[PDB]
Amino acid sequence: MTADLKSLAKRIYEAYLKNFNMNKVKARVILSGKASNNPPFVIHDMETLCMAEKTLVAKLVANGIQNKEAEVRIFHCCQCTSVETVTELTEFAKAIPGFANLDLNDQVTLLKYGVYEAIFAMLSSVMNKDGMLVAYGNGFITREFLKSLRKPFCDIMEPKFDFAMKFNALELDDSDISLFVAAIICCGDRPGLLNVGHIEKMQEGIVHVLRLHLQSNHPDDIFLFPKLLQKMADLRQLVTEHAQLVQIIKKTESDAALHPLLQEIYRDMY
Numbered sequence: 001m002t003a004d005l006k007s008l009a010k011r012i013y014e015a016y017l018k019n020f021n022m023n024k025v026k027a028r029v030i031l032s033g034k035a036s037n038n039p040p041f042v043i044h045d046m047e048t049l050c051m052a053e054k055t056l057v058a059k060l061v062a063n064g065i066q067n068k069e070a071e072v073r074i075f076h077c078c079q080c081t082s083v084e085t086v087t088e089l090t091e092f093a094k095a096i097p098g099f100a101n102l103d104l105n106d107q108v109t110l111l112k113y114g115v116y117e118a119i120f121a122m123l124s125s126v127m128n129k130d131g132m133l134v135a136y137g138n139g140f141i142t143r144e145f146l147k148s149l150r151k152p153f154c155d156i157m158e159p160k161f162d163f164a165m166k167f168n169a170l171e172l173d174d175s176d177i178s179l180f181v182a183a184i185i186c187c188g189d190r191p192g193l194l195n196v197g198h199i200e201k202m203q204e205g206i207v208h209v210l211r212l213h214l215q216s217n218h219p220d221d222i223f224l225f226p227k228l229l230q231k232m233a234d235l236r237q238l239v240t241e242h243a244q245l246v247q248i249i250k251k252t253e254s255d256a257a258l259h260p261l262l263q264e265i266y267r268d269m270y
Ligand SMILES: CCCCC/C=C\C/C=C\C/C=C\C/C=C\CCCC(=O)O
Pocket: 043, 052, 053, 056, 057, 073, 074, 075, 077, 078, 079, 081, 082, 083, 134, 135, 139, 141, 156, 246, 262
């Protein structure tokens, strides 16, 4: 006559496998070199960037002399990835107990502050020390190539690789990551929330599910739960810094149009 926390953890996991196009197993199959059909195109320099664009995002480079600068095209593709992950996170959040019972405005606020923290947590799954999967698993862009871009665009991805190398060393699987993403979304201290009390109870419940799951799934790492609490705080700081860089790009790079959904996420955020 009590809550079945193991069942809730499995529900969350299954919602994550249903709603995200990429998961850690899918990414590892690709990254291993086992994709015998449509393997990822390796983007390690300008020649291979431009080849990959012509095949994978042809419309973006179909403008001749009017095509935007490479770095701006890359930033545009980064934004398209975020817009898609935001859509996936919004549907995933319906699986979190209590989330769909909140007022619509509180659901919006929780997603507004939580999406980029979740984005950078899950981005770790497509990153290794050399590069990252992009374009629905059809490209692999190298870490060194992204570092080679002109300022400020070379400064976007490196802090996310730094976060990801340490996050990946925790050896989480998708059952853990799904619950960590749910816990990110359920933070009662986001600015502007109306029903803080109910959100705090939603947070306590999902963090309880997370804690018990990590205890079972990672008996070898008794500090994994507090490590993940710290990672949540690190992600908040990573997002604050990322938003600051995006604002520099907005002020100083006239061609780097911000998609309106992301502009709304960033507006009044930090
Ligand atoms: C062939 C098309 C792809 C070529 C490679 C170009 C770009 C890399 C694509 C995706 C990179 C993945 C995630 C983006 C990371 C951070 C979001 C920054 C934009 C934002 O603040 O939302």
